[model samples]
Target: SGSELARKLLEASTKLQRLNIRLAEALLEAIARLQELNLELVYLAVELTDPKRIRDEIKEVKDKSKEIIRRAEKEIDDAAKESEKILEEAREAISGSGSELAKLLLKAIAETQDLNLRAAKAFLEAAAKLQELNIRAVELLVKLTDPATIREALEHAKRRSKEIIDEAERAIRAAKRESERIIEEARRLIEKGSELARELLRAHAQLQRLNLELLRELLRALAQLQELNLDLLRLASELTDPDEARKAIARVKRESNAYYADAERLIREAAAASEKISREAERLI
Candidate 1:
């Protein structure tokens, strides 16, 4: 009976992991496309002085950005619902099961599910930040058209930057909490010296690595956003100077590239952790 329960749990977790990978991959694609559009907006704003011409050029970019974000949002939404359904089934399957071994395997399932849920929520927030950046890019063009609007744009960007970072900080905190919980639970199993504990700890180690790397990349992106915002303010003040505009745009492009790679790396590592978690569950079965 315990083995059967483990089998059910493994199936549900495998499905959840697949969905997580899909959601993460979609997010990566969306962010990359949006950053590309954002960079283009900056160059067009500075190179073409006419507001009408700038808008015309960016029309296609704007359309593409909207489409990309919408698709990613839909992907995340679908994955969320699927995960919800799978978790419910898992709970039902786990019901009426007992024994310390069953409980230990159940702990593994619960932790795996918790991590998946938090990761899904964090990815959604990440997507939301990208969408906001989408609006901010348009605002950059608006500021270019009217110098007076630069102050207002900077104010909005500053607020948005703070909001994004705050949420990201919350995510990091959540990860820290989960990591601590895993370690504490692992210690209990270690005292018992259950064979399962070794495999669980192996998975826990992977998760710890994932949390650390994810936090590092997230902090890098958040810092990059702040710096980019400051540079925009300076660029706006020197709108009349072409060289200043060019240099700022170049830096923005470079900074975006750096974060894009980091974010992609984070997603890849997440997928790896998910796989490991699923594999460990299978071994228990």
Candidate 2:
């Protein structure tokens, strides 16, 4: 009887050892997966926000501003459409997965969606704001109205309230196994966002200054033309000789026409130089 009980005890001890081994292996697996996912996630975040990557984006903003000045509305619209398609597809692809990975895959999709969204609106809004500026610039030159504030406010409000999310059900497919490298890559991108944001803001402020400068410069030239118009009107009012008075009016027409062309040439010259000046300002920023 004692021997039989001892044999049962020995079997119990063997079973317990096997259970412990299984539990240890499972722990290793869970920790490895956690490590891998964080690595991948951080890498993705940082990769998206890297300094050079962000700087290029700033350059793109500057370049797109130039395009806006050049009257390239179509290019801006096409680009916005293209980037929106990227996010739409990514949101669609999020509905599938492989292995035990889920959250990590969804994160990649989300970060990239934000990235593309950022780029998409940059050009479109650049065109939009510059168009508004073009209108305001004219209003300033011709009417001396202060609508520049109104347009600036609209742009600021538009820049705020930016949409940040879209739905998706994707999981890590290819990167499920390579989590460490991915997270390793994400470190730099996080800090870079701050710098890039600052640069972009600075560029925006610079553009606003350009807007004011354009208004002021064109109005200056227009002021000269305005004085000439006044002088001609005053001169014609007193003339009683019909033929001589007629010539006075005709000369007024020629002078007005000539200076209108001159003012236009001056505004165009400033607008063209704005690109070069802005490029230098951006580099300093």
Candidate 3:
């Protein structure tokens, strides 16, 4: 009865595990898009030439931000739908078991779901804040009255991006700790081996490994943005002179192109990495 119940609990847990990796991928996607948009916005603001193109491009950035939010929300909604089935199954399994082990499994399931939703919420909130940053940057560009004002807007975007990444890092660490806690609880539930305890050990290990991969990717992406933003700010200062502005524009265009290309590569790699993680999770499930 214990092993049967444990198998059912694990089945329920595995069903939702895929969603966590998906959430991680979505966060990476959001940052990749936001960083690209931030770079492009800075370039447009510093160019300060051809107001028509600049204005139109800003509109494009707004549209792109909307697209990012829409896609993430869709994923969140889909995940929510999928989770209802998991909860139903879990409830049925848990209802039959009144042991402490069953309670631990319930806690683990709840914690996993909570983490997934919180990560999704963080991604959406970050997107909203960035969209506002986009608007503010546009407004400063429209004024054309103060180059310093535009630079400050870029500064704020950079800070906001940093904050988003830091929050993600914190989330990953919290998840790692929670996973460990569950594993420890699983060990405590019995004097010897049991199917549920063994399954929990394996599942939590998989979770920790996948989360480690995500943390590494997030840190790498954050470092890349820091370097890119440094160059962007440096170029923003040179926009005062018409000739210098033209030269800076040329330089940023070249550099930004490189950054965009690299970002594309990074996103592709991240997608593939998360896909592999998903496959592994599916296998375990």
lDDT by residue (tens digit), candidate 1, 1-285: 445765665576467556655665676666567666666666666677776776677777767766876777787677767867876787777667765654565565556556655655565565457456645556574545465666666666667767776676677677767756765775666676644445555554555456445544655564564556456555744577777788878877777787777777777777777787768656774
Model 3: colliding residue pairs: none
lDDT of 2 by residue, 1-285 (tens): 222222222222222222222322232222222222322222222233355564554344445445433443343344345434543443344333331122232243334323322332332333234333322332222222244653444344333212211100011112222333333333333333334333333332333233334333333433343344334333333343546655665665566556556645544554455455445434533
* Local accuracy by lDDT, each model: 0.63, 0.35, 0.62
**Residue by residue across 29-106, what tens digits does model 3's lDDT show?**
666676667666766776656777877888888888788777877877777777777778777767867776666666
Total backbone collisions for each predicted model: 0, 11, 0
- Arranged by TM-score, best first: 1, 3, 2
How high is the lDDT of residue 63 in model 2?
A: 53
For each of the candidates, the C-alpha root-mean-square deviation to the true structure, in angstroms, is 4.6, 28.5, 4.9
Model 3: CA > 4 A from native? 46-53, 93-100, 141-164, 190-196, 212-216, 219-223, 233-285
Candidate topping TM-score? 1
Which of candidates 2 and 3 reaches a greater lDDT? 3
Question: At residue 155, what lDDT does model 2 achieve?
Answer: 42
